[PDB]
Design goal:
Layout (H helix, E strand, L loop, with lengths): L7 E2 L4 E5 L2 H8 L3 E5 L9 H9 L3 H13 L7 E5 L6 E5 L12 H7 L6 E4 L11 H11 L3 E6 L2 H9 L3
Parallel strand pairs: 2-7, 3-5, 6-7
Antiparallel strand pairs: 1-2, 4-5
The chain binds 6-methylpyridine-3-carboxamide (8EJ).
PDB class: viral protein, hydrolase
Keywords: Macrodomain, ADP-ribose, SARS-CoV-2, viral protein, hydrolase
Assembly: monomeric
C-alpha cells in the first residue's frame, strides 16, 4: 500500500490522475518525483518551471552546480538530484523536444529511466511544451515502464481524452 489517492488504474503498474504535479508532490512527498527536464537543466516553464518555482529556485541552483561539474545530459537520459520540499529525490528525465526536432524514438529510452525506481510520481514525457502527442507518450509509458508510475495530467480536457482513448 502507498499514499497516492484518486488515481484511475490503467494497467498492472500504471495509474493516472487529473492533478497539478506540484500540488500532488507537496501532498504525497513521494520518494521520486520526475521532472520534464532539458539537457541543460534550465527549468524555465512547464513541469520544470513549475517544480522549480515551488522549490523557491533551489532546484535551479542545485542543477547549475550539477551541469558545471558534469556537462549536459543526453536526450533520453536522466540524473537523480534532490527533491527539495517536494519529494526525497527528483529524477530529471529528458524526453525528446519535437519543437527542437529531436527523434521521437528517444521517448522509449527516456521512459526506461523510470525502471530504476520502484515507485514514481511523473508527468507524461515529451507532452506539453515538448510538442509530442500525449496519447503516444502514454502508450510508450505503458509499454516501457515496469515499475509503479503515478501519472499527473494537468489539463482536465487532456486527462479525459487520455482515459477515453486508452487501449
Ligand atoms: C503552474 C503549473 C503547474 C503544472 C504545470 C504542468 N504540469 O505543465 C504547469 N504549470
Amino acid at each position: 500500500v502507498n499514499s497516492f489517492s484518486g488515481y484511475l488504474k490503467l494497467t498492472d503498474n500504471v495509474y493516472i490522475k487529473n492533478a497539478d504535479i506540484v500540488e500532488e508532490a507537496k501532498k504525497v512527498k513521494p520518494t521520486v518525483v520526475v521532472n520534464a527536464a532539458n539537457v541543460y537543466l534550465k527549468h524555465g516553464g512547464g513541469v520544470a518551471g513549475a517544480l522549480n518555482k515551488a522549490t523557491n529556485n533551489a532546484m535551479q541552483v542545485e542543477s547549475d552546480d550539477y551541469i558545471a561539474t558534469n556537462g549536459p545530459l543526453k536526450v533520453g537520459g536522466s540524473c537523480v538530484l534532490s527533491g527539495h520540499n517536494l519529494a526525497k529525490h527528483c529524477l530529471h528525465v529528458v524526453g525528446p523536444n519535437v519543437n527542437k526536432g529531436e527523434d521521437i524514438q528517444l521517448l522509449k529510452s527516456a521512459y526506461e529511466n523510470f525502471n530504476q525506481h520502484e515507485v514514481l510520481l511523473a508527468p507524461l514525457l515529451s507532452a506539453g511544451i515538448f510538442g509530442a502527442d500525449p496519447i503516444h507518450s502514454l502508450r510508450v509509458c505503458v509499454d516501457t515502464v515496469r515499475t509503479n508510475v503515478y501519472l499527473a495530467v494537468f489539463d482536465k480536457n487532456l486527462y479525459d481524452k487520455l482515459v477515453s482513448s486508452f487501449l
